[model samples]
Target: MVGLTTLFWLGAIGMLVGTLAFAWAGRRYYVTLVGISGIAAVAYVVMALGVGWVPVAERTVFAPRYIDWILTTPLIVYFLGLLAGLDSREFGIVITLNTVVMLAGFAGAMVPGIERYALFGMGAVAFLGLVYYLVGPMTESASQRSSGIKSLYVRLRNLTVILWAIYPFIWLLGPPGVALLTPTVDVALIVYLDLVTKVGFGFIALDAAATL
Candidate 1:
């Protein structure tokens, strides 16, 4: 109860916080950010409702969360691509890896049996691949651009790296691993992460960039 309630308010409040970006739609990045926040508003609200009512399951899945990322993550990476001058080849690869992370998580939860954990592990590996590509290829290329763009890339990339690094650990506490955490703890941690990464990261990144 505490877990779901916390998650609900976090998401609901975060939606309001993110939506506050609409006042700066004069620039492309801010416009893009408004869209990002708008999409997330619906996503978070819907998922909050799901998490609030859904019975805890042995499957260790948040279907709404995974689905939410599938839709929103692309737009975010694409936003980075635009600001960082990421080439199509780079964009294509990064987008593919990130999208796979969501699908793999779905499989990890839905496939059933011990192999489900294996699938979760596979998804974690995919996330690593996404991280490597961003910090390695994408960050390297973006660095050659103007200082402002490079600053944006560095802040966004590093923030994402640090924030997402905690995810696999949190995931391990769920059904896919040793089940070290109660469902409430598990949901609460993930929900907190969503507020931080999904909402907090955006505004911080927005401040770091000189442009969109």
Candidate 2:
């Protein structure tokens, strides 16, 4: 747990420093980067301290992480729109679907036994829609951008897709779902994913968006 705490603090500090450098470089765009990273930094602190947790089925559901996801995930969609150029209507649709996914997953984590799986199924439906939009419509939109922007979009999109895909499996095996993993292992795995998906992705995205 101490290790996980240190890792979480490192994630927050890393993102803070990264954002400072990004802004110092005069990249005024990617405000979404700031929102995502800032939100995660707070959530990581709450999670590190084991705050906002609910015990279910002998395992704790860390509510702050879900809250973090609910807030930050939409920002990611907006950031994607920055690259892929979505209309207001398109933004509304994708963001709504993304919200459904996060809320359902949160509900699933809070619930116990079979109902958790039920919510997971509901979230899965929304997840499919989100990914479809990402790979199909979003990809097409990015293709029309400059080559450098397109290349960066592809990398971010792929990283987002892959990491987001891994999250459900982790939940399934961890405390919230099947309990196949110990609580400590579950926390560690999720923190690792957060580091890459939010913190690491932010820096990569900031650098590229700055150039373009």
Candidate 3:
């Protein structure tokens, strides 16, 4: 639990610093995405960590299952924004569909029993698919693309800001978990989510730094 707290705080601080750096560089889109992600990351980390050490009456930790859904929604939006920046419509649509599937799986996670666990597995698979999609071909330069692709990319990227802002309630559900399995899955999901967000944003940060 302490380890998980450290990871969450580390990611939260990293994102806060990263957002300021992006703003300083005048990368507004990157700054905005990083800012939103950082806020959510910190909120989640503090809540989860608090539940572990603090008394239940004093803690407001949300449901572990719900947090899993909330975290993934932003991730999907973040990748969609990246796709928009890269001007990849095909991949953006793929991510959009994935976001819907996650919402469905979120509903399943709320239900009781091993079936809920199965939905969580399905959500995890979908999450990996988005990561694989983002890390590969879409990372290429827009200058290399045809004009139509570039146009689509800009539109999608611009649209991502709104999409990401509205996705956090997926994490806001209540009834924090007490089981060991709950925290274990929550910790794992958060770590991976932070990795994807930081690494993805870090790529943009490095690119921005190169211009200096």
| The candidate that achieves the highest lDDT relative to the unseen native structure | 2
In candidate 3, the residue pairs with backbone N, CA or C atoms under 3 Å apart (3 or more residues apart, or in different chains) clash, namely 87-153
Ranking of models by TM-score = 2, 1, 3
- What overall lDDT goes with each candidate model? 0.72, 0.82, 0.50
Selected candidate, larger TM-score, 1 vs 2: 2
Ranking of candidates on lDDT, top first:
2, 1, 3
Cα lDDT over the full model 3: 0.50
RMSD of each: 2.8, 2.1, 8.7
Candidate 1 on 1-212: residue-level lDDT in tens? 36665675577677667768644534366766666666767766776676523333454455666666677777778877776787788889889988888787767766657787788777788888988887787877887798877887788777778878887788777655668887677877776777676667677766665355
Candidate 1 regions exceeding 4 Å error are 1-3, 23-27, 50-60, 209-212
* Candidates 1 and 3 compared by lDDT, better number: 1
Ten residues in sequence with the least summed lDDT for candidate 3: 169-178
Can you write out model 3's per-residue Cα lDDT over 96-173, one digit (the tens) per residue? Answer: 656755665555535544464566556556755654444444435443556755555444443433333323322322
- Estimate the overall C-alpha local distance difference test score of candidate 2: 0.82
TM-scores for all predictions? 0.85, 0.90, 0.50
Error of 3 at 77 (Å): 5.1
lDDT of 1 at 97: 88
**Regarding lDDT, does 2 or 3 come out ahead?**
2
